[PDB]
Amino acid sequence: MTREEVLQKVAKIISNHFDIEADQVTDQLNIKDDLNADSISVMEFVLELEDEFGTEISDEDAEKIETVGAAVDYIVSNS
Structure with missing residues (x-):
């Protein structure tokens, strides 16, 4: 619910789904571009985050x- 829990989860789920480093993942390193994640996938990631965090x-x-x-x-x- 807090920035910590959220930041961690996001960093985990992201560093787990893609081949990015959970430690390298920085605000100056957009995953969408860096990893070149597809568009459709966005509909999924945006969902989990909206569900887990509830926003x-x-x-x-x-x-x-x-x-x-x-x-x-x-x-x-x-x-």
Whole structure:
């Protein structure tokens, strides 16, 4: 629910789904681009995060909030 739990989970699920480093994952390293994750996948990642954390993610911002920081900064700031 907090920035910690969220940041961790996201970093884990992401570092687990892709071949990125859970330690390298930085706000300046968008996974969507870095990993080049597909578009459809976004519909899934944006869901799990919205479910686990329990927050509504817009359809537009959902295209920007696809980075380590762009994610937590959204889930947290949104609460």
